[PDB]
Paper text:
Here, we present the 2.8-Å cryo-EM structure of homomeric human LRRC8A (HsLRRC8A) channels that for the first time shows NTs resolved at a local resolution of 3.0–3.2 Å. The HsLRRC8A protein was heterologously overexpressed in HEK293S GnTI− cells and purified at high NaCl concentration (≥300 mM, see STAR Methods). The final model was built for residues M1–W411 of the pore domain, with the exception of disordered residues F69–D91 in EL1 and residues V177–G230 of the intracellular loop IL1. Concordant with an accessibility analysis, the NTs, resolved at 3.0- to 3.2-Å resolution, locate at the inner surface of the pore domain and span nearly the entire width of the membrane. However, the NT (M1–L20) of HsLRRC8A channels can be partitioned into four subsegments, which we named NTa (loop, M1–P3), NTb (310 helix, V4–F10), NTc (loop, A11–Q14), and NTd (310 helix, P15–L20). Although the narrowest portion of the neck is wide enough for the passage of hydrated halide anions (∼7.0 Å), it is narrower than the size (11.0–13.0 Å) required for the experimentally determined passage of larger anions and molecules in native VRACs.
An LRRC8 subunit consists of an amino terminus (NT), four transmembrane helices, and a carboxyterminal LRR (leucine-rich repeat) domain. Recent cryo-EM studies of LRRC8A, LRRC8D, and LRRC8A/C channels reveal a hexameric assembly of LRRC8 subunits around the central axis of symmetry that defines the ion conduction pore. LRRC8 channels can be activated by low ionic strength and cell swelling.
Residue numbers in the entry:
A (entry chain F), B (entry chain E): 1 to 68, 92 to 176, 231 to 539
Write the structure that this text describes.
Amino acid sequence: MIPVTELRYFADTQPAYRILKPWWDVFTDYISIVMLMIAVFGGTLQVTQDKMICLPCKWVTKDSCNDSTGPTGIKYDLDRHQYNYVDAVCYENRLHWFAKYFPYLVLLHTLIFLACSNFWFKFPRTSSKLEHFVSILLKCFDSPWTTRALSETVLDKKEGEQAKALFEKVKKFRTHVEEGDIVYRLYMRQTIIKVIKFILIICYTVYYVHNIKFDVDCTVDIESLTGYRTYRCAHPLATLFKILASFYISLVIFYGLICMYTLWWMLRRSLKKYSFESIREESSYSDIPDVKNDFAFMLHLIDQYDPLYSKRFAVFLSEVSENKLRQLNLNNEWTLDKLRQRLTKNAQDKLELHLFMLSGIPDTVFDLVELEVLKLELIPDVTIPPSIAQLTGLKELWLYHTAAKIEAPALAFLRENLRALHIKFTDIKEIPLWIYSLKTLEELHLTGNLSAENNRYIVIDG
Amino acid sequence: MIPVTELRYFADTQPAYRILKPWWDVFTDYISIVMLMIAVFGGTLQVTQDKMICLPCKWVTKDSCNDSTGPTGIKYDLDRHQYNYVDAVCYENRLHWFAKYFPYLVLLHTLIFLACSNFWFKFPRTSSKLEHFVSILLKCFDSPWTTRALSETVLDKKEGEQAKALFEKVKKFRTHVEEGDIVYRLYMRQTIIKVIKFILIICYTVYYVHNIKFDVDCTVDIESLTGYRTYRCAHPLATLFKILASFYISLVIFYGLICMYTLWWMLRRSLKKYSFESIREESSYSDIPDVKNDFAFMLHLIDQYDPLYSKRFAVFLSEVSENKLRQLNLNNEWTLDKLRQRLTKNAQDKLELHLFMLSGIPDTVFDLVELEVLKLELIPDVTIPPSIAQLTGLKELWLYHTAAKIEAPALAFLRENLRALHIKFTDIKEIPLWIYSLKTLEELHLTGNLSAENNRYIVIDG
Ligand SMILES: CCCCCCCCCCCCCCCCCC(=O)OC[C@H](COP(=O)(O)OC[C@H](N)C(=O)O)OC(=O)CCCCCCCCCCCCCCCCC
Ligand SMILES: CCCCCCCCCCCCCCCCCC(=O)OC[C@H](COP(=O)(O)OC[C@H](N)C(=O)O)OC(=O)CCCCCCCCCCCCCCCCC
Ligand SMILES: CC(C)CCC[C@@H](C)[C@H]1CC[C@H]2[C@@H]3CC=C4C[C@@H](O)CC[C@]4(C)[C@H]3CC[C@]12C
Ligand SMILES: CC(C)CCC[C@@H](C)[C@H]1CC[C@H]2[C@@H]3CC=C4C[C@@H](O)CC[C@]4(C)[C@H]3CC[C@]12C
Ligand SMILES: CC(C)CCC[C@@H](C)[C@H]1CC[C@H]2[C@@H]3CC=C4C[C@@H](O)CC[C@]4(C)[C@H]3CC[C@]12C
Ligand SMILES: CC(C)CCC[C@@H](C)[C@H]1CC[C@H]2[C@@H]3CC=C4C[C@@H](O)CC[C@]4(C)[C@H]3CC[C@]12C
């Protein structure tokens, strides 16, 4: 007999955690609220009317009532207070404890269920991890960069800066969490406790629910006080208590079935590992590693909520997207005046630029229309963009340990507008295959072994 | 007997979803609150007074009361507690279950109705979709471009990029949801469940409501306890319960009528597919496709709220709108006149403009009446507009990897006012087929391989 809204304290989380609640958690929260309602109703029902009316049996045979002008009433010669005394005594002694304390057992079981549901949200060690993960997930879902990505079928420096900051935050969080294995373990334990709690409530309640009967029969051995051997009592609340007990059993059965579904869902597919196979297969972004424990599980929960969050979060775990972002913001801070002052006119009166150890080629490079020599040193995974057609005066290109991809327009421009090529390489992988389709080259300079085992000079057959 | 604020846990949803509640959902929510109110009232009424005053009948005929100095009272020789006992016994055994458990049945039915109404708001797999859809819908309704468009009959950078971002968010959301089918199916299932629940409730309640009588007659066979065979009872709460049951019947009838209207509205017109036919007539946007399942459904739902939402949202579904947005942002960021400073008189003493790698042709181009040479480089999906007829002095057009389409007026202008054409192409798709219908051409320049395997010079047969 304590209002639901004050018992609700046990069952309430942040609205932020709404993402972390799969459908089974939501269903069990609803069912727990209903269980709490019937616990409160039964408790008030008992407290305000716990009556038990008892009448003595004048003819008693074998500790049992013999059950045998106009009719006249039977006279027992008992005070109202003697009737009250025998009611209290037979309600205390010869009434089954289940019919007495059922609405309190219901409340206690419901509170244990609520505590099991919300423990991992209240426990600080996992509450911190969940709130950190949900904040990161919401920021990734909010970031404009995740909109630009996945859309491949010039950007602002400030947003392009906070996007790299989000990459760093994701990396730090992943490093900090991916070794924990505490959220998964705690969730395992909570579900197991819920299942073995349901599997006990069902047995004991079904076993004892037959003891809630309306017509109780008591023999309390108080002959000195009232003068009657045995009494025939009547527990008026018994029918409504059976109804509430049966309704509670139905609710507990549903709760246990849902918890068994959750337990089975966790016993299969090994939630400690996360695949990301679908995204890397439908976006060609294969560079998304399998996520280890305590981070695979938290992603599996969001998949139960919305696969969209996982998809929009995978973009912040791929190295390809990181490279794209670093190229994109390399262009943001690179103006053209900072590029102009950095340029050098060399000994042959040719304007040159020398770059080394960057993540790629800034696109702002190719607006420096006076440039005549381009040098690229130790830059990985380069692709030549079409804007190279703007460098009408280019004569030399130096590729030092830099493999380069290219498509046809830029290729044609280079076929028609190049005089020299320098290459410094370790092996064949740093030799672009397209060089032999060129036609205006006047100098070629190769630094490295041109031969392989049993394949002498295959590199230069063309 | 739980106050209706605790029950209001089941009966509420976040106001973000007023857009998704048609008038029938609003009416059923109101009716459900009223039914909950009468359930609570009946529950407290029963708990505080579930009395059944019973008096014995001294003259009994055919298991019924014969009902046949100054007047004096009838002496029954029963203690107060024997009266209590027979009240309890006749209330348990000889009072109809409907008259006892009517308010609890009302509470159970109302809870089931509320659950069936809010399930699709609580179910994460559809709750996520509805939240996503409504957020996109509100952003589209409030976005400045939605009123910049539809009015056709120096722009903020932030606004200009968020409009583009909103276009892509609409595209991604449409792709993610349009193959769903789940929201509509689950809504239909909820409505069907409500309709069968109404059909069952009205049946059983009408069939049994006649059993709530005031004067009950009980024969419970307790002579060993009271000495009286049959009793004439009286359920003081019977008339109030009858009027409460009739009020509940009225509410259930209204609820069922509304739910059958919803079922009918869902059954006809094939809500799995939208039209946009009305919108695309008053907008001159024939490029707005029919919308498939799970997206047509929420469009239909919003139309039940305000058709303006769907109208202001349909702009982000037409390719023409995206093209116009890109043209407008392009012309804004590359100002009308900055172009004049950008022009160049070339080596052949012809005034030229060189453009590259844009999304289309800025309309500001065709105010540059001094032009003689136009260069277009790597621009997709170009259609030449009629305003090219303004450029009376045009003598050269260079299309470098820029496919172009055209209609007859601009085409005739170019037929009559062109001397040379240069084309740089990857394959035939970048060759405009109309060139052979030209008449005033003096130079043709093709850059690219004109031949394919076993198909020499088919490209140039014309
Ligand atoms: C609404 C929130 C309810 C809050 C309850 C408040 C107090 C109620 C009674 C107290 C019981 C609560 C559980 C206490 C268990 C110890 C918690 C604690 O702080 O220890 C820290 C532990 C230690 O980490 P570990 O060594 O890596 O894991 C092995 C672990 N010893 C094991 O169980 O192997 O780190 C852990 O890993 C935690 C151990 C696992 C505990 C799992 C319990 C799940 C549900 C428990 C809720 C209580 C249910 C009944 C209470 C309801 C009462 C009406
Ligand atoms: C306030 C919200 C109340 C929340 C309920 C809390 C728990 C109360 C009792 C639980 C009953 C819930 C209804 C069943 C939902 C089960 C969800 C579940 O287990 O799997 C999720 C299912 C997956 O199925 P599917 O892939 O779409 O195809 C099969 C499909 N079901 C079919 O019929 O082929 O996805 C689905 O498709 C869902 C099935 C659609 C059925 C629509 C049910 C609407 C009314 C249900 C409300 C409960 C009413 C009674 C509760 C009141 C108790 C007082
Ligand atoms: C959820 C599905 C399975 C419906 C659940 C209904 C079952 C589990 C509940 C509802 C009513 C309950 C019964 C109500 C009363 C009695 C009579 C008693 O002498 C033995 C237990 C017994 C028989 C209960 C057993 C469990 C019961 C049958
Ligand atoms: C679906 C969920 C929410 C409710 C399930 C309905 C069940 C649990 C409810 C509704 C009808 C109820 C039963 C109707 C008939 C009786 C007769 C009564 O003398 C003993 C209890 C018993 C057996 C009730 C027990 C509880 C009961 C079975
Ligand atoms: C606003 C609407 C929905 C209220 C519903 C009005 C009707 C359904 C309610 C209001 C007044 C009620 C009636 C008042 C008169 C009587 C006579 C009484 O001896 C039996 C109940 C009965 C027959 C009631 C039945 C239900 C009743 C007719
Ligand atoms: C909103 C509209 C549908 C109101 C409809 C009113 C009708 C359908 C409802 C309202 C009150 C109801 C009546 C209330 C009182 C009685 C008297 C009882 O001995 C038999 C049932 C009976 C006859 C009910 C039958 C249905 C009833 C007449």
